[PDB]
């Protein structure tokens, strides 16, 4: 019912962003079997060469679906997320979490 | 293959945002039958009362899926979109279009 778009801003420069994606590669199959999870995808800009596109190369955009706030809050306490957090602490600068519903 | 997240910033105040949503209510079934379209949903913040959530009440976030850039570019020239644009010109301030792929 809830869609989460979390933008993760990574440190510029030498594979900070790929290191974050590599952490996601380890965890996404597990997140996706989490209870309440109907989607969890780390997306990056695709350069399309069109004027109307905005790009942000030090950015990963997470598109997620969660059945409820309770399920999202359990998700954040799971071990794979505390492990992720620990592993990316030198590569991430911030994360902006929106929680959305059909408008 | 392509995911578009377009954030539409509406003018603050008396139902500018609802007027935009009402335009979307007319067009979304049609957009969704467009060729190349595997999703087209106007989302708004759900107040969740949690510290980590960022909210933006004069914002609509479009989450879309398009088979290609050619299909997205045709979409923008369709009559329902030129009609939408015309109808919302006094309610919208800007639109930030990201075009994303799996990272």
From Swiss-Prot, chains A, B:
Encoding gene (name): ygiN
The record lists the organism as Escherichia coli O157:H7
Q: How does it assemble?
A: Homodimer.
On the tree of life, the source organism's domain of life is Bacteria
- The organism's taxonomic lineage, starting at the top: Bacteria, Pseudomonadati, Pseudomonadota, Gammaproteobacteria, Enterobacterales
What name is this protein filed under? Answer: Probable quinol monooxygenase YgiN
Quote the catalytic activity from the record. menadiol + 2 O2 = menadione + 2 superoxide + 2 H(+)
Could you tell me which residue ranges the ABM domain spans? Answer: 2-100
GO CC annotation: what is one? cytosol
Does the record carry Aminoacyl-tRNA synthetase as a key word?
no
């Amino acid at each position: 019912m809830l869609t989460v778009i979390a933008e993760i801003r990574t440190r510029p420069g030498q594979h900070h962003r790929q290191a974050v994606l590599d952490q996601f590669a380890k965890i996404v199959p597990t997140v996706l079997k989490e209870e309440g999870c109907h989607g969890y995808a780390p997306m990056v800009d695709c350069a399309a060469g069109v004027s109307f596109q905005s790009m942000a190369p030090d950015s990963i955009v997470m598109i997620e679906q969660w059945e409820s706030i309770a399920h999202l809050e359990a998700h954040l306490q799971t071990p794979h997320m505390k492990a992720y957090s620990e592993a990316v602490k030198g590569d991430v600068l911030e994360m902006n979490i929106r929680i959305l519903q059909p408008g």
